[PDB]
Amino acid sequence: NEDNARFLLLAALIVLYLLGGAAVFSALELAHERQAKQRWEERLANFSRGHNLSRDELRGFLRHYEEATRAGIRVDNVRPRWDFTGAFYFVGTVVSTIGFGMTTPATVGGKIFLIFYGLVGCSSTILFFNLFLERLITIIAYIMKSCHQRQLRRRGADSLAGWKPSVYYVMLILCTASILISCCASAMYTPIEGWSYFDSLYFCFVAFSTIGFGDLVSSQNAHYESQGLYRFANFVFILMGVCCIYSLFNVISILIKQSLNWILRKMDSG
Amino acid sequence: LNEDNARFLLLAALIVLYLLGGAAVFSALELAHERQAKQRWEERLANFSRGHNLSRDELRGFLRHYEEATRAGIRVDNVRPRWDFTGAFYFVGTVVSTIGFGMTTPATVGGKIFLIFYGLVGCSSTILFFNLFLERLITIIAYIMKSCHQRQLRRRGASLAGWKPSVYYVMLILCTASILISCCASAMYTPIEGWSYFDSLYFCFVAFSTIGFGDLVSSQNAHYESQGLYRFANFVFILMGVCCIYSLFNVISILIKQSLNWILRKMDSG
Ligand SMILES: *[C@@H]1O[C@H](CO)[C@@H](O)[C@H](O)[C@H]1NC(C)=O
Ligand SMILES: *[C@@H]1O[C@H](CO)[C@@H](O)[C@H](O)[C@H]1NC(C)=O
Ligand SMILES: *[C@@H]1O[C@H](CO)[C@@H](O)[C@H](O)[C@H]1NC(C)=O
Ligand SMILES: *[C@@H]1O[C@H](CO)[C@@H](O)[C@H](O)[C@H]1NC(C)=O
Ligand SMILES: [K+]
Ligand SMILES: [K+]
Ligand SMILES: [K+]
Ligand SMILES: [K+]
Ligand SMILES: [K+]
C-alpha cells in the first residue's frame, strides 16, 4: 500500500501544481492577452474602415488564410514543407515527440502513417534517450574512476563500473550540459533567426523538453546562409539538447520519487 | 566495442535510417496535397486582391497583424478566451505532460521564465507519474492473474506478486486499452467538435503520444453545452490516454531493446 500511497500523493501534488501554475500564468499574462486582442481588434477596425471592407468578407478571407497557414504557407518566406529536407525536420519533431505543428499532415493516408510511425519511432527514441542516459552514467563513472586511478598513480609516482555517480551529481552534470547546449544553440540562433537571446533560450527549453509549442521554430524561413551546414547544426543541437533535457527530466523524476518516499516515511511515523 | 556502446550506435543508425525513410514517404504522401493547398491559397489571395482592389503589400501587412493576433490566441471562429484560469489550466496540462499544442503560448518575458522554471519540475513530475502509472498497471495486471488463479483453484478444489506478466502481455493490454480510450475519446469529440471520427482518432494519437501538433485541439472553441462536464471529461480522457500511450512507448522501447540485443547476439555469433 506504500506504492499506491505514493501514486496518490504524486497525483495530488501534480494537481495542486497544475492549479498553482494555472493561477500564476493567468495572473502573469491575462493583461498581455487582453492587450493583444484589443490591438488586433483595433487593427481589424482600421483595415475595414480604410479600405471599405465588410466584416463578413474579412472573416472569410481570414478563414482562407487560416486554412492556408494550416497547409504550411506563411507571410514571410517560409521554406516549402514536405520536401525531403522539410519532411526530415517534421519526422524529427514527430519521432522525438516535439511536434511543433509547423508541418502537419492533411491527407488521410498521411495521418494513418503518422499514427503507425509515431507508435514505432517515438518508442524507439524513448529507448534512445534511456540508452543515452545510461551511456552518460557509464561515461561519468569511467571519468571518475580514471581520475581516481590517475590520482593513485600520481601519489605513488568484467562488468567493472564499481564507482557510480550519485543522482545529485548526475543532475548537476546534466543541468550544466543542458545550459551549455542551450547557450550555444541560442548563440547560433540569435544572429541567424533574429530572435532575442531570451527568446532563443525559451525556444531551446521548449524544443529540448519535447514540449514544442511551435510559436518559435528554428529553421523554417528560407534563404539561409550556409543552409546545408545550418540545418545539420540545428538538427545536432536539437538532438543533444532533447537528449540532455529528457535525461535531466528522468534524473529529477528519480529525485522527486525519493522525495515522495521521504514524505511518505515522515507521515508513516506520525 | 562495448555491448552497450554497440547497442547505442546500432539504435542511433536505425533511428537515422528510420527518419530518412519516414521523411521520404511523408514527402511522397503530402507534397502533392501541400502544393494543391498552396495553389488554392494563391488563387484565393489573387481573387481577394483583384476583387476588393487591395495592394499585395497592404494585404501582407494585414496578414502579419493577423499572425501576431493568432500568436496571442485570436482565431477566426469564436475560440475561448486565452490565459483565463480554465484556459491556463489546459495550457499548464499541455506543458507538464509535454504535449504542448501551442493554442496558448507565453509572450511576456516573465511568463516564459516561469514556463522554464515551472516546466522543469512539472515535466519531471509528470514523467515520474507516467512511470508510476506503468508500474501500478503491472501490479494491477499481476493481481488480476493471481486472483484468476485463486478463483480457478478454488473452483477446481470445490507483497507477493513476484510473478509479473510478460512484456508481450503488457504490450497487448496497453495497446488494447489505448485503442479503447482513443475510441471513447473520439466518440466524445466527434459530435461536440464536429471533427471526423478519423480526425478525432488522429488527434487522440497526437495528444496521447505527447506529440501535440496543435492543428486539432479539443476544448478551444467557446460556448459548449455543459462546459464544466465536457472540460473535465476531456481532461480525464487526455490524462488516461497520455498515460496509456506513454506507458505503451516504454513497453515498446523495452521490446526494441530486446530486439537490438537479439540483433547484436546475431552479429556476435557470426
Ligand atoms: C487604429 O486606429 C486609429 C486609426 O487611424 C489609429 O489612431 C490607431 O493608432 C490605429 N492602430 C493601429 C495599431 O494601427
Ligand atoms: C463600400 O462598398 C460597398 C459595396 O460596393 C458600397 O456599396 C459602398 O458605397 C462603399 N462605401 C464607400 C465607397 O464609402
Ligand atoms: C478564384 O480564382 C480562380 C482563378 O482564376 C477562379 O477560377 C475562381 O473563379 C475564383 N473564385 C472566385 C470566387 O472568384
Ligand atoms: C483602386 O482603384 C482606384 C480607381 O480610382 C485606383 O486609382 C487605385 O490605384 C486602386 N488601388 C488602390 C490600392 O487604391
Ligand atoms: K513530448
Ligand atoms: K516525452
Ligand atoms: K510535444
Ligand atoms: K507540440
Ligand atoms: K504544437
Q: Å from B239 to nearest chain A CA?
A: 11
**Whether A88 contacts B19, CB under 8 Å:** yes
Q: What phi and psi, each to the nearest 5 degrees, are found at residue B221?
A: -70, 140
The one-letter code for the residue type at A249 is: F
Q: What is the C-alpha separation between A41 and A37, in angstroms, rounded?
A: 6
For ligand 4, the distance from its centroid to the CA atom of residue A49, given in whole angstroms, is: 16
CA-based nearest residue to A5, from A193, A188, A260: A260
- β-pair partners for A221: A78
Choice from B40, B41, B43, B52 to test ligand 3 binding pocket (greatest atom count within 8 A of CB): B43
Q: What is the C-alpha separation between A182 and A249, in angstroms, rounded?
A: 15
CA-based nearest residue to B1, from B269, B266, B264, B262: B264
Give B80's DSSP letter: P
What architecture is domain A129-269? Answer: Orthogonal Bundle (1.10)
- Other Cβ atoms less than 10 A from the Cβ of A266: the count is 9
Give B84's DSSP letter: S
Torsion A85-A120-B258-B262 (CA) sign: negative
Q: Å from A15 to nearest chain B CA?
A: 9
Q: What is the C-alpha separation between A82 and B111, in angstroms, rounded?
A: 33
Q: Cα-Cα-Cα-Cα dihedral of B250, B256, B257, B263, to 10°?
A: 180
Question: Looking at chain B, after which residues does the C atom sit over 2.5 Å from the next written N, breaking the chain?
Answer: 158
Choice from B53, B59, B62 to test ligand 4 binding pocket (greatest atom count within 8 A of CB): B53
Q: What is the C-alpha separation between A168 and B66, in angstroms, rounded?
A: 47
Q: Which residue has the cell 521554430?
A: A217
CA-based nearest residue to B109, from B101, B98, B117: B117
Cell numbers at A210, concatenated? 519535447
Q: How many residues does chain B have?
A: 270
Ligand 3 atom nearest B43 alpha carbon: 2
CA-based nearest residue to B207, from B106, B47, B90: B90
Residues in chain B with CB shorter than 8 Å from the CB of A111 are 198-199, 202
- Other Cβ atoms less than 10 A from the Cβ of B82: the count is 25
**Whether A66 contacts B75, CB under 8 Å:** yes
Q: Which residues contact B146 (CB under 8 A, 6 or more apart)?
A: B160, B161, B163
- Collapsed DSSP state (helix, strand, coil) of residue B270: coil
For ligand 4, the distance from its centroid to the CA atom of residue B53, given in whole angstroms, is: 6
Q: What is the C-alpha separation between A45 and A20, in angstroms, rounded?
A: 37
Helix axes A55-69, B56-72, angle to 10 degrees: 70
Q: What is the C-alpha separation between B178 and B198, in angstroms, rounded?
A: 15
Q: What is the C-alpha separation between B12 and A235, in angstroms, rounded?
A: 14
**Whether A68 contacts B67, CB under 8 Å:** no
**Whether A219 contacts A185, CB under 8 Å:** no
Per-window interface: B 157-216 vs A, CB < 8 A: 198-199, 201-202, 205-206, 209-215
- β-pair partners for A78: A221
**Whether B223 contacts B234, CB under 8 Å:** no
Contact B116 A11 (CB under 8 A): no
CA atoms within 13 A on the CB side of A194: 3
**Which residue's CA is the closest to the ligand 4 atom numbered 11?**
B53
Q: Which residue has the cell 480554465?
A: B86
Burial of A171 (0-12, 13-18, 19+ CB in 10 A): middle
Give B225's DSSP letter: S
In three state form, how does the secondary structure of chain A look?
CHHHHHHHHHHHHHHHHHHHHHHHHHHHHHHHHHHHHHHHHHHHHHHHHHHCCCHHHHHHHHHHHHHHHCCCCCCCCECCCCCHHHHHHHHHHHHCCCCCCCCCCCCHHHHHHHHHHHHHHHHHHHHHHHHHHHHHHHHHHHHHHHHHHHHHHHHHCCCCCCCCCCHHHHHHHHHHHHHHHHHHHHHHHHHHHCCCHHHHHHHHHHHHCCCCCCCCCCCCECCCCCHHHHHHHHHHHHHHHHHHHHHHHHHHHHHHHHHHHHHHHHHHHC
Q: What is the C-alpha separation between A163 and B51, in angstroms, rounded?
A: 75
Alpha helices in chain B (DSSP H): 3-52, 56-72, 85-96, 109-157, 167-193, 197-208, 227-269
Q: What is the C-alpha separation between B18 and B8, in angstroms, rounded?
A: 15
Q: What angle do CA A68, A70, A74 make, to 5 degrees?
A: 55
For ligand 3, the distance from its centroid to the CA atom of residue B53, given in whole angstroms, is: 15
For ligand 4, whether the C-beta of B55 sits within 6 Å is yes
CA-based nearest residue to A89, from A199, A67, A80: A80
| B55-269 has CATH 3.20.20.70 classification | no
For ligand 1, the distance from its centroid to the CA atom of residue B243, given in whole angstroms, is: 48
CA-based nearest residue to A251, from A189, A138, A168: A168
Ligand 1 atom nearest A49 alpha carbon: 4
Q: Which residue has the cell 480526425?
A: B199
Q: Which residues contact B233 (CB under 8 A, 6 or more apart)?
A: B188
- Domain boundaries in chain B? 1-54, 55-269
**Whether B94 contacts B213, CB under 8 Å:** no
For ligand 3, whether the C-beta of B147 sits within 6 Å is no
Contact A33 B83 (CB under 8 A): yes
The one-letter code for the residue type at A19 is: L
> What's the resolution in A?
3.2
**Whether A205 contacts B116, CB under 8 Å:** yes
Cell numbers at B40, concatenated? 488554392
The one-letter code for the residue type at A119 is: L
CA atoms within 13 A on the CB side of A44: 22
Q: Cα-Cα-Cα-Cα dihedral of A8, A13, A14, A15, to 10°?
A: 90
Q: Which residue has the cell 593513485?
A: A152
Cell numbers at B209, concatenated? 503520444
Q: What is the C-alpha separation between A211 and A198, in angstroms, rounded?
A: 17
Q: What is the C-alpha separation between A183 and B184, in angstroms, rounded?
A: 44
Q: What is the C-alpha separation between A124 and B15, in angstroms, rounded?
A: 7
Cell numbers at B143, concatenated? 493481481
Cell numbers at B153, concatenated? 483453484
The one-letter code for the residue type at B245 is: I
- Other Cβ atoms less than 10 A from the Cβ of A153: the count is 9
A129 reaches B (C-beta below 8 A): no
Q: What angle do CA A94, A97, A101 make, to 5 degrees?
A: 60
